[PDB]
Amino acid sequence: KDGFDLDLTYVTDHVIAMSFPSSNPIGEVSRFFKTKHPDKFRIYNLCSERGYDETKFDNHVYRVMIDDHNVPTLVDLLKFIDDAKVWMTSDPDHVIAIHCKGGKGRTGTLVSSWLLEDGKFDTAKEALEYFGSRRTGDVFQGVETASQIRYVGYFEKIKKNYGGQLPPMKKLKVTGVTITAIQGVGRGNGSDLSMQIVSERQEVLLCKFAEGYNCALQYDATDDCVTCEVKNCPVLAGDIKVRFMSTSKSLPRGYDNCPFYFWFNTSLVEGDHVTLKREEIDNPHKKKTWKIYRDNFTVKLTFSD
Ligand code: NA
């Protein structure tokens, strides 16, 4: 419209999703907002990797450092909701524009959460699906990774069960991992696998199954599964990312430079373990990998503390 040719979408009348303003060239994204929404916009940059001259948007850019194919911290997500809320409710004409690189996975994570906050939807599934329709009914059009779906759900849970405020802190130690449908995955018995636990951007534990480096591996051919005792785990708090690596050539890497990974938040765990199915693990959630990760592929972390 009106001389503009932009990868930009009105998710609602006052919520916009878009691509990175590059040098979508930044000058025309700059014009667009100065023309269509003068003095009434706030840009959210969701890329940890890239920034720009924010003066082109009159310094109205707010940054969320999110890694490509990952999730914001819950703290960060909640802060974004607060910032957007204040801006949105201040003036009925105020508009928010949210972006990552593709205006896809990270973007969809905050937009669907914003849609929850704003009461347009009751459930994360509905919001995600709605964002998916506007951006392109499937939850995976909305965001890119299973952890991104989980974090929208986390926000749903916070809003519904914790009055929009952070839950009470729990801390955990990982004591065990079980992986089911191990056959056809890497070497098929877990010998090629290692697990890295990441908290606050740092490695906090590395386990190598074959060598028994911080672990003890057990392979059960009858049950087609691996159980691994995890040792030396530090106390874990907040948003934990668990990454699985392979030394095996037949196990390809998806996003995050590994075969498969996932995020969870310690306080939003229930009881004693978390079990993820195939469509809830990052990378195996993609149909292209389903002859490797079969439909009873599963990852379970066992906790204490
Ligand atoms: Na404590």
Coordinates of C-alpha atoms and ligand atoms in Angstrom, one line a residue, residues 169 171 235 305, ligand 1:
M169 CA 11.0 -20.7 43.0
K171 CA 15.3 -25.7 42.4
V235 CA 21.4 -27.0 41.7
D305 CA 15.4 -31.4 45.5
Ligands
NA1 NA 17.2 -21.9 48.2

